[PDB]
């Protein structure tokens, strides 16, 4: 009930990791 | 709060898709670019 | 108690808006 | 959960500072770049 807030939280974390992979690709296309 | 927490969770998710999609566009622009 | 989870949530939203301003600057430096 | 929710909130924040800082570095690289 709460348990559901946590689920949301997990889901959030997961988009942030996907954002990190995007930036890893962008960084290389530039030349970091 | 609660009705409230899940209103903020949605704005957050919704913001997160907007960010992923701006990043996807930039990545595709380089490529090239 | 919960009330504190909301506070966190607000804080999260706020970094996402700051990320959006960063990307607005990056987009212009490129030429979107 | 709770002990738990605020463990996930922290990882999330911590991830969010990492993202802001990668973006800041990219922005500074262009500039230029």
Curated annotation (Swiss-Prot), chains B, D:
Q: Where is this region: Leucine-zipper?
A: 5-26
User: What family does this chain come from, according to its entry?
Assistant: Belongs to the bZIP family. GCN4 subfamily.
Q: What is this protein called?
A: General control transcription factor GCN4
Task: Give the disulfide map.
Answer: none
User: Could you say which residues of the full protein are shown?
Assistant: 249 to 281 of 281
What does a knockout show?
A: Abolishes recruitment of the mediator complex to the upstream activating sequence (UAS) of amino-acid starvation responsive genes. Decreases RNA level of genes involved in amino acid biosynthesis and cofactor biosynthesis during amino acid starvation or methyl methanesulfonate stress. Growth dependent on amino acid supplementation. Sensitive to amino acid starvation. Sensitive to purine starvation. Decreases cellular glycogen levels during glucose starvation.
Which species? Saccharomyces cerevisiae (strain ATCC 204508 / S288c) (Baker's yeast)
Induction of the gene: Translation is induced by amino acid or purine starvation, or during growth in low or poor carbon sources. Translational repression during nutrient-rich conditions is dependent on four uORFs (upstream open reading frames) present in the 5'-UTR of the mRNA; these promote ribosome dissociation. Translational induction occurs in conditions reducing translation machinery efficiency, leading to ribosomes scanning over the uORFs, and increased translation of the mRNA. The rapid translational induction is followed by transcriptional induction at later time-points, independently of the uORF sequences.
PTM summary: Phosphorylated by the cyclin-CDK PCL5-PHO85.
Name where it's found: Nucleus
Q: What is known of its domains?
A: Residues 89 to 100 and 106 to 125 define the N-terminal activation domain (NTAD) and the central acidic activation domain (CAAD) respectively, which can function independently to promote high-level transcription of the target genes.
Role this protein plays:
Master transcriptional regulator that mediates the response to amino acid starvation. Binds variations of the DNA sequence 5'-ATGA[CG]TCAT-3' in canonical nucleosome-depleted 5'-positioned promoters, and also within coding sequences and 3' non-coding regions. During nutrient starvation (low or poor amino acid, carbon or purine sources), it activates genes required for amino acid biosynthesis and transport, autophagy, cofactor biosynthesis and transport, mitochondrial transport, and additional downstream transcription factors.
According to the record's subunit comment, the protein's assembly and interactions are: Homodimer. Each subunit binds overlapping and non-identical half-sites that flank the central CG base-pair in the pseudo-palindromic motif 5'-ATGA[CG]TCAT-3'. Interacts with the mediator tail; the interaction with GAL11/MED15 is direct. Interacts with the SAGA histone acetyltransferase complex. Interacts with the SWI/SNF chromatin remodeling complex.
């Amino acid at each position: 009930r709460m348990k559901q807030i946590e689920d949301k939280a997990e889901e959030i974390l997961s988009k942030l990791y996907h954002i990190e992979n995007e930036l890893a690709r962008i960084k290389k296309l530039l030349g970091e």
